[PDB]
Amino acid sequence: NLQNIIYNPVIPFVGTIPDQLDPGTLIVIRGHVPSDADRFQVDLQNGSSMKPRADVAFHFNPRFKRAGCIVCNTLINEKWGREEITYDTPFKREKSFEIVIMVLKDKFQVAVNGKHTLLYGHRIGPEKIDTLGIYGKVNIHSIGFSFSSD
Ligand SMILES: O=C(O)c1ccc2ccc(CO[C@@H]3C=CO[C@H](CO)[C@@H]3O)nc2c1
Ligand SMILES: [Cl-]
């Protein structure tokens, strides 16, 4: 049931999500962190405006300085909300990964390399997400969706 919208996209990548992010929908991202990486992000956006910047329902932002972390947050009218930081990060420089985002009724559930990593409660209705963005120092092998639609 996995339908890739792309392989080996140039970074930054910005793409339209082909169906609604209904409860039960999976987003699967396969990739690798370069050795010199400081951060990268996956942004589920309401639109693709660069100026002013599109609302980000879900900012998933692995950071690599010191013992590393993941910052998750939401951008509404170009303001960030309260950061949700996970200090347990499975991401490392020069390591491949499989990110799985599961869209539930009330939150995203993210697993990496087949292990639970974090939850994040919806602050924008996920039905308002229509765009996926990947920015920063990262190589992406694939991006795909398993929709509730099919
Ligand atoms: O790494 C890159 O090349 C790249 C590309 C596009 C970007 C867009 C935005 C930001 C700033 O991010 C925010 C700064 C501080 O806190 C926020 C989270 O609350 C959030 O992480 N950094 C970027 C970095
Ligand atoms: Cl839920």
Residue numbers in the entry: 7 to 156
Study authors write:
pmcGalectins are a family of proteins that bind β-d-galactopyranoside-containing glycoconjugates through their canonical carbohydrate recognition domains (CRDs). Galectin-8 is a divalent galectin found in the liver, the kidney, the cardiac muscle, the lung, and the brain. Galectin-8 is a carbohydrate-binding protein that plays a crucial role in tumor progression and metastasis, antibacterial autophagy, modulation of the immune system, and bone remodeling. However, there are major differences between the two CRDs, such as the presence of Arg45, Arg59, Tyr141, and Gln47 in the N-terminal CRD (galectin-8N) and the presence of Ser255, Asn257, and Asn348 in the C-terminal CRD (galectin-8C).
Galectin-8N was first cocrystallized with lactose, and then the ligands were soaked into galectin-8N-lactose crystals, followed by collection of X-ray diffraction data at 1.52 and 2.1 Å resolution for the galectin-8N–6a complex and galectin-8N–9 complex, respectively. Both complexes showed that the O4 and O6 of the d-galactal portion bind to galectin-8N in a similar manner as the corresponding oxygens in the d-galactosides. Namely, the O4 of the d-galactal is involved in a hydrogen-bonding network with Arg45, Arg69, and His65. Further, the O6 of the d-galactal engages in hydrogen bonding interactions with Asn79 and Glu89, while the O3 engages in a hydrogen bonding interaction with Arg45. As for the galectin-8N–9 complex, the quinoline ring is placed in a favorable position to establish an interaction with Arg45 while the carboxylate moiety establishes a water-mediated hydrogen bond with Gln47 and Arg45. The endocyclic double bond of the d-galactal moiety in both complexes is placed in proximity to the guanidinium side chains of Arg45 and Arg69. Compounds 6a, 6c, and 9 had nearly identical Kd values for galectin-8N, with compound 6c exhibiting the highest gain in binding affinity compared to its galactoside equivalent with a Kd of 46 μM.
